[PDB]
Amino acid sequence: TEKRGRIYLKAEVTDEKLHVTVRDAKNLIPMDPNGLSDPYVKLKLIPDPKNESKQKTKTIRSTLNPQWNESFTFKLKPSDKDRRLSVEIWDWDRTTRNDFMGSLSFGVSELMKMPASGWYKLLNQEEGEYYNVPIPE
Ligand SMILES: [Ca+2]
Ligand SMILES: [Ca+2]
Ligand SMILES: [Ca+2]
């Protein structure tokens, strides 16, 4: 909800597993010639040097206010204490590289001391890997 729009999420750590719900997003930035985008969300635990934690929602065509309503589960291990949940919205493009739309992240430990829930401001790509900005109201 500021330049790159906002996203509604839920994420809690229930003994063993991290549960994430990606509800919807609003006011996303136009990344297509038609003035829209084809948004999908990529969920990842970072760092992910082996590149194995990737999960993704379906792609919704031609919209800036997608409603995915999809949930995901990551098995956690003691090694994940220092990892973060990365949430990135991307714009599916058929004839070129997919465009970045907005992102954010949560510390696994952070989520364990308080599950995330509600609206969050979409951040730039690099910075999105470092923090999140909740939007109460
Ligand atoms: Ca595009
Ligand atoms: Ca597109
Ligand atoms: Ca592109």
Curated annotation (Swiss-Prot):
A 1,2-diacyl-sn-glycero-3-phospho-(1D-myo-inositol-4,5-bisphosphate) binds at residues 40, 90. Calcium-activated, phospholipid- and diacylglycerol (DAG)-dependent serine/threonine-protein kinase that is involved in positive and negative regulation of cell proliferation, apoptosis, differentiation, migration and adhesion, cardiac hypertrophy, angiogenesis, platelet function and inflammation, by directly phosphorylating targets such as RAF1, BCL2, CSPG4, TNNT2/CTNT, or activating signaling cascades involving MAPK1/3 (ERK1/2) and RAP1GAP. Depending on the cell type, is involved in cell proliferation and cell growth arrest by positive and negative regulation of the cell cycle. Ca(2+) 1 binds at residues 31-32, 91, 93, 99. It is found in: Cytoplasm; Cell membrane; Mitochondrion membrane; Nucleus. The modification Phosphoserine is found at residue 71. The gene is Prkca. Changing residue 54 to A: Loss of phosphatidylinositol 4,5-bisphosphate-binding and strong decrease of membrane docking. It comes from Rattus norvegicus. Interacts with ADAP1/CENTA1, CSPG4 and PRKCABP. Binds to CAVIN2 in the presence of phosphatidylserine. Interacts with PICK1 (via PDZ domain). Interacts with TRIM41. Recruited in a circadian manner into a nuclear complex which also includes BMAL1 and RACK1. Interacts with PARD3. Interacts with SOCS2. Residues 3-120 form the C2 domain. Ca(2+) 2 binds at residues 32, 38, 91-93. Belongs to the protein kinase superfamily. AGC Ser/Thr protein kinase family. PKC subfamily. Ca(2+) 3 binds at residues 93, 97, 99. This is Protein kinase C alpha type.
